[PDB]
Amino acid sequence: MSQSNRELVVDFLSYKLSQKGYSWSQFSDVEENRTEAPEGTESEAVKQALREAGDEFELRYRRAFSDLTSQLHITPGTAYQSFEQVVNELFRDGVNWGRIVAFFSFGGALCVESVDKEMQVLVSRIAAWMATYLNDHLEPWIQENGGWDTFVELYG
Amino acid sequence: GSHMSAMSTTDLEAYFKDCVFKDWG
């Protein structure tokens, strides 16, 4: 339900694309209705805790996650199935906040791999694929576990 | 583990399991 799930997905994607030298403002389609990116207060605190959690894991495991994105298909059609079956496996040990750190970090790296392959138009679709999964499976577990506001109090 | 046509287990049973040394974040 909550549109904030997409707003915090856009931020860590757009930052990873900016570190590769790319521009989200050129890839973005059309603005929807209301509310902006996480630059305020409590949503900016989620973003900050989540960014350090991704950045430390990317230092220690750059090789592992780059080899994991190399086998995953990212083109429309088969990718929507190829992503689902792999994400349903990485949460199979538990739906915990530690596996949510891996889920977002993998999705952000897949978006980069698409732009780097000259498939920049998919930045909108790959972001929707992970945000739709996050609404379909994680959102009720996230709210039962105190929301992203609890994640920043645990990991910030 | 050996390879299967449905899942690259020889590679993925490494990368997913290799992360054991950090409980994320």
Question: If we measure between CA atoms, which residue out of A64, A60, A138 comes closest to residue B23?
Answer: A60
Query: What residues of chain B have any CB closer than 8 angstroms to a CB in chain A?
Result: 8, 11-12, 15-16, 18-19, 21-25
Helix (H) or strand (E) holding B9: helix B9-18
Shortest alpha-carbon distance between residue B5 and chain A (Å): 13
Q: Which fold has domain A1-156?
A: Apoptosis Regulator Bcl-x (1.10.437)
Å between A33 CA and nearest CA of chain B: 34
Chain B partners of A99 at a C-beta cutoff of 8 Å? 24
Cα–Cα distance, A116 to A107 (Å, whole number)? 14
Kindly report the backbone phi and psi dihedral angles of residue A140, in degrees, each rounded to the nearest multiple of 5, phi listed first: -65, -35
Chain B hits for A71, CB-CB cut-off 8 Å, are 8, 11-12
Contact between A57 and A105 under an 8 Å Cβ cutoff? The reply is yes
CA gap B13, A128 in Å, rounded: 28
* Among chain B residues, CA nearest to A52: B25
Q: Do A57 and B24 touch (CB under 8 A)?
A: yes
Would you call A98 exposed, middle or buried from its count of C-beta atoms within 10 A (0-12, 13-18, 19+)? middle
Tokens of A108: 């952000």
Pull the structure tokens for residue A38.
């996480």
Nearest C-alpha neighbor of A127 from the set A8, A1, A2: A8
Is A5 strand, coil or helix?
helix
